[PDB]
Amino acid sequence: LKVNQDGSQVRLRDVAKIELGGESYDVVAKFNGQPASGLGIKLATGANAL
Amino acid sequence: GAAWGGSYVNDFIDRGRVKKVYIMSEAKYRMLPEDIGKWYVRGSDGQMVP
């Protein structure tokens, strides 16, 4: 990110907390109280449901 | 181009409607070929150039 005048260098570790996380934290699903994820499938117009 | 033909810079909100923002010379200064000399362009030295 920057090199200080004394030669010291600052990186994303020094100013942030890099971490693998979700794109968005808005939606949280639970199945019978257990942490879970799912797909909400919508039928296309004029298609057989079965 | 901006002085003689005009330029659509960006938009603005008026009474909840997006409207364009144009800039152009006031008509007095873009009517005759002699009006070319009235326009100055800044140089790297900071001196306006006819």
């Binding site: 934290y25 | 901006a2 330029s7």
Partner: protein, 50 residues
């Protein structure tokens, strides 16, 4: 060119997020969207551009 630059910079949209947005701190209780709209509507605001 300077007029164009100023006009482009003046009007914009800011995705300012929310107070208490996800992921929230434990115990958070207020979630409000942040609105920072430095938009110019009438003529005088445009004339007042630095």
């Amino acid at each position: 060119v300077d007029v164009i630059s100023a006009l482009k910079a003046q009007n914009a949209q800011v995705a300012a997020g929310q107070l208490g947005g996800t992921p929230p701190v434990k115990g958070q209780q207020l979630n409000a969207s942040i609105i920072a709209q430095t938009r110019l509507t009438n003529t005088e605001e445009f004339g007042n551009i630095l």
